[PDB]
Write a protein that holds these residues in place. Structure first.
Motif, short mmCIF file in Angstrom:
data_model
loop_
_atom_site.label_atom_id
_atom_site.label_comp_id
_atom_site.label_asym_id
_atom_site.label_seq_id
_atom_site.Cartn_x
_atom_site.Cartn_y
_atom_site.Cartn_z
N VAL A 24 0.84 -1.24 0.00
CA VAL A 24 0.00 0.00 0.00
C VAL A 24 0.86 1.27 0.00
N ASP A 25 2.12 1.18 0.40
CA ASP A 25 3.03 2.36 0.41
C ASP A 25 4.47 1.83 0.28
N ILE A 26 5.40 2.75 0.07
CA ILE A 26 6.78 2.28 -0.25
C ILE A 26 7.50 1.69 0.98
N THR A 27 7.21 2.19 2.18
CA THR A 27 7.85 1.56 3.38
C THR A 27 7.38 0.12 3.58
N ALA A 28 6.08 -0.11 3.38
CA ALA A 28 5.58 -1.50 3.44
C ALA A 28 6.24 -2.33 2.34
N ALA A 29 6.37 -1.75 1.15
CA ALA A 29 7.03 -2.45 0.01
C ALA A 29 8.47 -2.83 0.36
N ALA A 30 9.18 -1.90 0.99
CA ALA A 30 10.60 -2.15 1.31
C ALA A 30 10.71 -3.29 2.32
N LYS A 31 9.77 -3.35 3.27
CA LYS A 31 9.78 -4.45 4.26
C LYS A 31 9.45 -5.78 3.57
N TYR A 47 15.17 0.74 6.95
CA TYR A 47 15.26 2.22 6.94
C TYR A 47 15.76 2.69 5.57
N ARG A 48 15.51 3.96 5.33
CA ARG A 48 15.85 4.58 4.03
C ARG A 48 17.24 5.18 4.03
N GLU A 49 17.98 4.92 2.95
CA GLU A 49 19.33 5.53 2.77
C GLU A 49 19.34 6.59 1.65
N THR A 50 18.43 6.48 0.69
CA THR A 50 18.35 7.50 -0.39
C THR A 50 16.89 7.80 -0.74
N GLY A 51 16.69 8.92 -1.42
CA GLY A 51 15.36 9.26 -1.95
C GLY A 51 14.53 10.10 -1.03
N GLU A 52 13.48 10.63 -1.61
CA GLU A 52 12.52 11.44 -0.86
C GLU A 52 11.67 10.53 0.00
N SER A 53 11.27 11.04 1.14
CA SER A 53 10.33 10.30 1.99
C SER A 53 9.09 10.00 1.15
N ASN A 54 8.60 8.79 1.32
CA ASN A 54 7.37 8.35 0.61
C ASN A 54 7.67 8.08 -0.87
N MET A 58 16.95 3.72 -1.93
CA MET A 58 17.66 2.57 -1.33
C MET A 58 17.21 2.39 0.11
N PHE A 59 17.09 1.13 0.49
CA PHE A 59 16.70 0.77 1.88
C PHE A 59 17.66 -0.29 2.41
N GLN A 60 17.77 -0.34 3.73
CA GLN A 60 18.64 -1.31 4.43
C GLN A 60 17.82 -1.99 5.54
N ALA A 61 17.86 -3.31 5.57
CA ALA A 61 17.13 -4.08 6.61
C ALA A 61 17.95 -4.16 7.90
N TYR A 62 17.23 -4.35 8.99
CA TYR A 62 17.86 -4.52 10.32
C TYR A 62 16.94 -5.39 11.15
N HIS A 63 17.53 -5.94 12.20
CA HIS A 63 16.76 -6.82 13.09
C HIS A 63 17.41 -6.97 14.46
N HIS A 64 16.68 -7.64 15.35
CA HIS A 64 17.27 -8.01 16.65
C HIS A 64 18.27 -9.14 16.41
N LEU A 65 19.46 -9.01 16.96
CA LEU A 65 20.47 -10.09 16.85
C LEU A 65 20.07 -11.24 17.79
#
Length: 87
Positions: A24-31, A47-54, A58-65
């Motif tokens: 439904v939106d680009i943050t959901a798409a990136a996940k 989280y976002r590394e490049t581009g306008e909000s929304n 480029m995006f980078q994933a992260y998680h609990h170790l």
């Protein structure tokens, strides 16, 4: 619902293999793209590394170790997420 074109970049050794996700939106798409790139054991966010909000970028994933009380770390390499209109 929108369609987004994913380029896993260094995650697939920059082979040029790409795919789409619907969200439904680009943050959901990136996940969704991170889940597809990193597989079913991945639980986390991006989280976002490049581009306008929304917008595309480029995006980078992260998680609990695993095994740690509160450690959060990046997982995988950055990947690109782009708005794509299907006909």
């Amino acid at each position: 619902m929108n369609t987004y074109l994913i380029d896993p970049r260094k995650n697939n050794d920059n082979s040029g293999e790409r795919f789409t996700v619907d969200a439904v939106d680009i943050t959901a798409a990136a996940k969704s793209a991170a889940q597809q790139i990193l597989g079913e054991e991945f639980e986390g966010l991006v989280y976002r590394e490049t581009g306008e909000s929304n917008g595309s970028g480029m995006f980078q994933a992260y998680h609990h170790l695993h095994g740690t009380n509160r450690t959060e770390t990046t997982v995988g390499y950055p990947f690109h997420v782009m708005e794509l209109l299907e006909h």
